[PDB]
Amino acid sequence: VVAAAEKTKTKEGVLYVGSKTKEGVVHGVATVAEKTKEQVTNVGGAVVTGVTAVAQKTVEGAGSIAAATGFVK
Amino acid sequence: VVAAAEKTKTKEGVLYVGSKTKEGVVHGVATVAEKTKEQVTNVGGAVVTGVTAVAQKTVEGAGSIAAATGFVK
Amino acid sequence: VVAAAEKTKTKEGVLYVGSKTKEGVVHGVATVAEKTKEQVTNVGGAVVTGVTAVAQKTVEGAGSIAAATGFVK
Amino acid sequence: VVAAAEKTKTKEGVLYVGSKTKEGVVHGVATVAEKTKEQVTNVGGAVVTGVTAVAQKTVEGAGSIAAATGFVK
Amino acid sequence: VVAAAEKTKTKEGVLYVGSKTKEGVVHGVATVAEKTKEQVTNVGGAVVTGVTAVAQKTVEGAGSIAAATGFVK
């Protein structure tokens, strides 16, 4: 499992957010198991969770996610 | 499982968001198991979850996601 | 499972969002298992989930998602 | 499973969204199993799910999704 | 499991957020197990969870996440 990233090197990337919520429940990244013999979870990269969620320019330049998520029996 | 990313190198990328919610429940990325012998999960890359979700310019430049998500028996 | 991305190198990419929700439930990316012997899940790339969801210019430049999602018995 | 993307290098890409929902349930990407011996799922690329969903200019430049989603017995 | 990142080297990256919530519960990244013999979880990269969540310019320059998340029996 190899991940390699290489990077070699007016308004830009400007963000305006307004949010008004009376109530919020946010769970983000959740793994729940009840009575389960095996759970394997891999979360990779960027997760934005919100009542309001904004992602701007998440990856500029190299991004490399490599995942192996397995069980061998 | 190999992921390689290489990058070699007015209004631009400008974001305006307004959100008004009386109530919000957001679950994002969730794995739930009840009574399950095997769950394998791989979440890769960018997940935006919101009552309002905005993604702008998520990947600019190289993005490489590689995933192997398996069980061998 | 190999993913390689290479990148070699007025209003542009401008976003305006307004959202008003009395109530919101968003589940994003979810895997649920009840009483299941095997679940294999791979989510790759960008998922935007919202009562309002906007994706702009998701991939500019290289994007490479490679997935193998299997069980061998 | 190989995915390679290469990229070599007024109003443009301008987005206006207004949304008003009294109520919203959004499930995004979901895998559900009840009582199932095998589920294999691969979701690749960009999924936008919303009461209002907009995708603009999703891929500009190279996009390469490669998926193998199989079980060998 | 090898992750290598190399980097070689008006308004820019400007953020404005206003949020007003009467109530908030946020769970971030959570792993919950009840009565489960094995849970393996790997969360990698950046997770932003909020009633309002904003991520701007998350990765500029190299990002490399490599994960192996497995149990061998």
From Swiss-Prot, chains A, B, C, D, E:
Changing residue 27 to Q: In PARK1; no effect on protein structure; no effect on phosphorylation of the protein; no effect on membrane- and lipid-binding; increases oligomerization; increases fibril formation; increases secretion of the protein; impairs copper-binding. The modification Phosphoserine is found at residue 64. Phosphorylated, predominantly on serine residues. Phosphorylation by CK1 appears to occur on residues distinct from the residue phosphorylated by other kinases. GO terms for cellular component: actin cytoskeleton; axon; axon terminus; cell cortex; cytoplasm; cytosol; extracellular region; extracellular space. GO terms for molecular function: actin binding; alpha-tubulin binding; beta-tubulin binding; calcium ion binding; copper ion binding; cuprous ion binding; cysteine-type endopeptidase inhibitor activity; dynein complex binding. Residues 6-44 are annotated as: 4 X 11 AA tandem repeats of [EGS]-K-T-K-[EQ]-[GQ]-V-X(4). Cu cation binds at residue 27. Sequence repeats lie at residues 10-18, 19-33, 34-44. One of its GO terms (biological process) is negative regulation of apoptotic process. Highly expressed in presynaptic terminals in the central nervous system. Expressed principally in brain. Its main location: cytoplasm. It is found in: Cytoplasm; Membrane; Nucleus; Synapse. Keywords: Acetylation, Alzheimer disease, Amyloid, Cell projection, Copper, Cytoplasm, Disease variant, Membrane, Metal-binding, Neurodegeneration, Nucleus, Parkinson disease, Parkinsonism, Phosphoprotein, Repeat, Secreted, Synapse, Ubl conjugation. Neuronal protein that plays several roles in synaptic activity such as regulation of synaptic vesicle trafficking and subsequent neurotransmitter release. Participates as a monomer in synaptic vesicle exocytosis by enhancing vesicle priming, fusion and dilation of exocytotic fusion pores. Mechanistically, acts by increasing local Ca(2+) release from microdomains which is essential for the enhancement of ATP-induced exocytosis. It is linked to Genetic alterations of SNCA resulting in aberrant polymerization into fibrils, are associated with several neurodegenerative diseases (synucleinopathies). SNCA fibrillar aggregates represent the major non A-beta component of Alzheimer disease amyloid plaque, and a major component of Lewy body inclusions. They are also found within Lewy body (LB)-like intraneuronal inclusions, glial inclusions and axonal spheroids in neurodegeneration with brain iron accumulation type 1. Parkinson disease 1, autosomal dominant: A complex neurodegenerative disorder characterized by bradykinesia, resting tremor, muscular rigidity and postural instability. Additional features are characteristic postural abnormalities, dysautonomia, dystonic cramps, and dementia. The pathology of Parkinson disease involves the loss of dopaminergic neurons in the substantia nigra and the presence of Lewy bodies (intraneuronal accumulations of aggregated proteins), in surviving neurons in various areas of the brain. The 'non A-beta component of Alzheimer disease amyloid plaque' domain (NAC domain) is involved in fibrils formation. The middle hydrophobic region forms the core of the filaments. The C-terminus may regulate aggregation and determine the diameter of the filaments. Soluble monomer. Homotetramer. A dynamic intracellular population of tetramers and monomers coexists normally and the tetramer plays an essential role in maintaining homeostasis. Interacts with UCHL1. Interacts with phospholipase D and histones. Interacts (via N-terminus) with synphilin-1/SNCAIP; this interaction promotes formation of SNCA inclusions in the cytoplasm. Interacts with CALM1. Interacts with STXBP1; this interaction controls SNCA self-replicating aggregation. Interacts with SNARE components VAMP2 and SNAP25; these interactions allows SNARE complex assembly and integrity. Belongs to the synuclein family. This is Alpha-synuclein. The chain holds residues 15 to 96 of 140 of the full protein.
